[PDB]
Amino acid sequence: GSADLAHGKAIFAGNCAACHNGGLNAINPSKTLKMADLEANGKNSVAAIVAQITNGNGAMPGFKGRISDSDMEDVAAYVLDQAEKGW
Amino acid sequence: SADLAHGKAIFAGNCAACHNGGLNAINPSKTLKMADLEANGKNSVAAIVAQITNGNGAMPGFKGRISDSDMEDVAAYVLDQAEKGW
Ligand code: HEC
Ligand code: HEC
C-alpha cells in the first residue's frame, strides 16, 4: 500500500467519516462516495474531489484553510481508491 | 401554544435534515433524547439556544439565519419532544 493512502485514510477519519461513514452520506443519501454516485455527478477524479473538499456544497462545509492542499490530495486519493475497490 | 407549533415548524425547516426523529445520524452519541441532552449539559433553553447560535463540530451555527425569538421557540419544542419522547 501507499503511505499517501494511509495518510489520506487518517485524514478522512478525522474530517469526513462522521458524515460519510463507510463511503455513504448521512445527510443526503443520493450523494455517496460510491463510484457510481461519483461518476453520476462528475466527481470521479482527484481534482473534482479536491474542489469539493475546498469549497463544499449544500450541507457539506468547505475545508479551505482547515486542511492543507497536500492533505486534500491524500484524502482525494484515499476516497477514489476506496470507491474503485469498494467501500 | 403559538410558540411550540412555531418551533416545530422552524425545526422542520432547519434541523430535521440532521435530527429527524430526535436522532443524530452524523454523531449518534449526541441525539436530542432527554438522556443525551442531560449527558452533555444541554437540557436547558439557554444551552440549546447557544448550540443553535454557535454550532459545534459538524453542526453549523444559525446566527443571523434564525431569529433569537425563533431560537427560543425551537428550544422549547426540542425540550418538549425530549420530555414526551420523540
Ligand atoms: C457533513 C457536515 C459533511 C462533512 C464533514 C463532509 N461531507 Fe462530503 N458531503 C456532505 C453532503 C451533505 C454532500 C452532498 C452535498 C450536496 O450539495 O448535495 C456531500 C458530498 C460530497 C461529495 C460528492 C459526492 C457525490 O457526488 O456523490 C464528495 C466527493 C465528498 N462529499 C467528500 C467529502 C470529504 C473528502 C470530506 C472530508 C474532508 C467530506 N466530504 C466531509 C456532507 C459532509
Ligand atoms: C447537520 C448539518 C446539523 C444540523 C442542520 C443541525 N444539527 Fe444539531 N447537531 C449536529 C451534530 C453533528 C451535533 C453533535 C456536535 C458535536 O460537536 O459533537 C449536534 C448537536 C446538537 C445538540 C446537542 C445534542 C446533545 O446530545 O448534546 C442540539 C441540542 C442540537 N444539535 C440542536 C439542533 C437544532 C435545534 C437544529 C436546527 C436549528 C440543529 N441542531 C441542526 C448536526 C446538525
Numbering used by the authors:
A (entry chain A): -1 to 85
B (entry chain B): 0 to 85
Q: Could you give the paper's own sentences about this structure?
A:
Cyt c6 is a small, water-soluble protein (~12 kDa) that contains a heme group as its active center. As an essential electron carrier, Cyt c6 mediates between the cytochrome b6f complex and photosystem I (PSI), enabling electron transfer that is fundamental for sustaining photosynthesis by maintaining the continuous flow of electrons through the photosynthetic chain. The crystal structures of Cyt c6 from both species revealed a conserved fold, consisting of five α-helices, a bound heme group, and loop regions, which closely resembled previously characterized Cyt c6 proteins from other species. The heme was covalently linked to two cysteine residues via thioether bonds, and the central iron atom was axially coordinated by methionine and histidine residues, maintaining consistent coordination geometry in both oxidized and reduced states.
Three distinct crystal forms of Cyt c6 were obtained using the sitting drop vapor diffusion method, yielding characteristic red crystals indicative of heme incorporation. High-resolution X-ray diffraction data determined the three-dimensional structures of reduced Cyt c6-7942 (red-Cyt c6-7942) at 1.7 Å resolution, reduced Cyt c6-6803 (red-Cyt c6-6803) at 1.9 Å resolution, and oxidized Cyt c6-7942 (oxi-Cyt c6-7942) at 1.4 Å resolution (the crystallographic statistics shown in Table S2). Crystal packing analysis indicated that the dimers in red-Cyt c6-7942 and red-Cyt c6-6803 crystals formed higher-order assemblies. The tetramers and dodecamers were essentially composed of repeating dimeric units. Structural comparison of the peripheral and central dimers within the Cyt c6-6803 dodecamer also revealed consistency, with RMSD values ranging from 1.330 to 2.149 Å. The dimer interface of Cyt c6-6803 showed significant differences compared to that of Cyt c6-7942, being less extensive and lacking contributions from residues near the methionine axial ligand. Key residues involved in the dimerization of Cyt c6-6803 included Ala16, Cys17, Ala24, Ile25 and Pro59. Additionally, the distance between the iron atoms of the two hemes in the Cyt c6-6803 dimer was 17.0 Å, compared to 15.4 Å in Cyt c6-7942. The Cyt c6-6803 dimer exhibited a larger Fe–Fe distance and weaker dimer interactions compared to other Cyt c6 dimers. Notably, when one monomer of Cyt c6-6803 was superimposed onto Cyt c6-7942, the other monomer exhibited a 20° rotation relative to Cyt c6-7942, indicating a significant difference in dimer assembly. Despite the increased spacing, the hemes remained properly aligned, suggesting a structural flexibility in the dimers.
